[PDB]
Amino acid sequence: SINQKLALVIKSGKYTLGYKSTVKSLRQGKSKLIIIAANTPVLRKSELEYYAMLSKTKVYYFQGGNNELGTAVGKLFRVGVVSILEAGDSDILTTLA
Amino acid sequence: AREITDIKQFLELTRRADVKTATVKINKKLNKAGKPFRQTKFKVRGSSSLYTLVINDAGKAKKLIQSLPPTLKVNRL
């Protein structure tokens, strides 16, 4: 499960949350894998997809809303986009997800 | 009716030659809470609207009435 794969990284490795910080990370090239929620705005979705195309970053669409991405990271609030700066003890990069 | 808190502005208005009369209004007022004083009010019927001049000082009033053009009709109160 993806929830097991993510919650490990959030308790072990370096990460970020939200739009502005992910874009800052893509500019720095320090992002390795970005996670995009389903219910995110189309303009912000296209802007992240294009920025990742520039930085050459692997892109993963999270199946389900931002609430389920907040649940996945284990936080009460909602998150539109999550990045992976540092991959944890899991092999999340080389996997399909 | 419009406030001008500006001395030479009033004197510019008096010499317009489209002005027939002026008026100097004298009042009895008090400051803060302590003492009574005397307030003057220099009013000209301007081109469109009436312009007024509150001067809380009495010496500046004493100078200004003296400084008016002598051909202009001046009205007390």
């Binding site: 893509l26 500019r27 720095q28 090239g29 294009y50 520039l54 930085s55 | -």
Partner: protein
């Protein structure tokens, strides 16, 4: 990868120059004592060079190719970074932090910038940057 670079084209989203295209001359990834946020130093062009046909001659041609530039410190949050790129080496030492906040150093910044953009528009290259962003 830190894409927001010294030769990077961007589209300004906010404030008087909204819709106007820019180039980040010098990024500031973690702000300064003035501007405590991830911003960028840009030099874009306000009055776009207008179209010129074979009917226009000698004076109208001089009028159309004339470009009016602008310099502004702008936040990343009001920038739309573009895939495109532009040569910047002519005016890297011209615009800095000292260039901003103290004119008329902004004036002689604007003159070098005006020159660079007009000299680049003439001898037709980088045509996408000088076309009007239609919105």
């Amino acid at each position: 990868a830190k894409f927001l670079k010294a030769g990077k084209v961007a589209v300004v989203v906010r404030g008087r120059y909204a819709g106007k295209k820019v180039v980040i001359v010098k990024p500031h990834d973690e702000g300064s004592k003035s501007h405590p946020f991830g911003h960028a130093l840009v030099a874009g062009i306000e009055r776009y060079p207008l179209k010129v046909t074979k009917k226009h001659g000698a004076k109208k041609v001089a009028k159309r190719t004339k470009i009016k530039p602008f310099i502004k410190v702008v936040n990343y949050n009001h920038l739309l970074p573009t895939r495109y790129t532009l040569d910047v080496e002519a005016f890297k030492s011209v615009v800095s932090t000292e260039t901003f906040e103290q004119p008329s150093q902004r004036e002689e910044a604007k003159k070098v910038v005006k020159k660079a953009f007009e000299e680049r528009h003439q001898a037709g290259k980088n045509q996408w940057f000088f076309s009007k962003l239609r919105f």
